[PDB]
Amino acid sequence: MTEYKLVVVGAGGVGKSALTIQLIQNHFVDEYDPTIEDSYRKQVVIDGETCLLDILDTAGQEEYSAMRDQYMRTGEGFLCVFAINNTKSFEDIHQYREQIKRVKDSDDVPMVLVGNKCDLAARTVESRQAQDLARSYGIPYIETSAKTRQGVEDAFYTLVREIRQH
Template identity: 45%
Template sequence: MREFNAVVLGAGGVGKSALTVRFMRNEFLESYDPTIQEEYRETVVVDGEPTLLEVLDTAGAEQFTALNEIYISAGRGFVLVFSLTLEASLREVTNLRQQILRIKGENSRVPMVLVGTKLDLTNEREVSPAYVAELSGRWKIPVYETSAKRDWDVTEAFEDLVRQMRQYYPIEERRKKKGRKRRDRIRGGCPCIIM
């Protein structure tokens, strides 16, 4: 079974924990309790293939900026979260994306999804669907408008990220090489050393 880790990043109070807990435990967090760092590990099945997924739910980016560098360096996939009810939260996501590209390499297509939360709060919406679509096109990453409370498109966002990680990180070459070495030994007898 393949293993991946994903990092959930965004401003404080945008619904990162609610999104993560809805996906990993299928529960909705009613109250807001600021997160410092929470880790979840779960086997998820995407397209019939099981994957061990570790999700790191981080604190609001503006509160612990020094830790972001560590999270981003270790992360293999990223969920960039903003609130559809708070236009200002998009600025933080923009900064985080730039930080990821700086750390991972400007030209790399790092597995990433953009997630707008609180879709169920239609009367409070500040971010237009057109702007979200335009941002997704400009950044060339998929976008999901979600509601953790109603369980709308939460699973789809995480499954998309798992598919991207599978594609971006092919099965390690060393496993293939180990298997090839064993076959060579059997075929050719003892390995020779030339000095």
């Protein structure tokens, strides 16, 4: 049985812990509880393949910075998360991307870009803006809603389908 390591990375409050818990415990966390570090793992069958994915939920607060290296080393795939009503979280995806390919020392690491909270009316970041960025990185982009559960599976599954092809 295959074991895929996934690391969820992004600015604070963008919806990493919420997206994760929705895939696993299947239900929307309505509260904000600053994550330090939590790891989940579930029995899943993706494309007929039965795998056990180990998901590392990162801290978005810069106050829990340091930890970044250690966990970015031992992780196969990375899904970068930004909230569509948080312009800074978008602009922040760039520095995350670099820190990933910097510690890994590789110009190509499995990586999906997620646009979360797309269930909200507020929207300071257009989908093209993301499309353009994901494109120049050579990676896929998915818009999700931990609340409405939109694209949540699409995001994580595409990330494993990504690791395999690489």
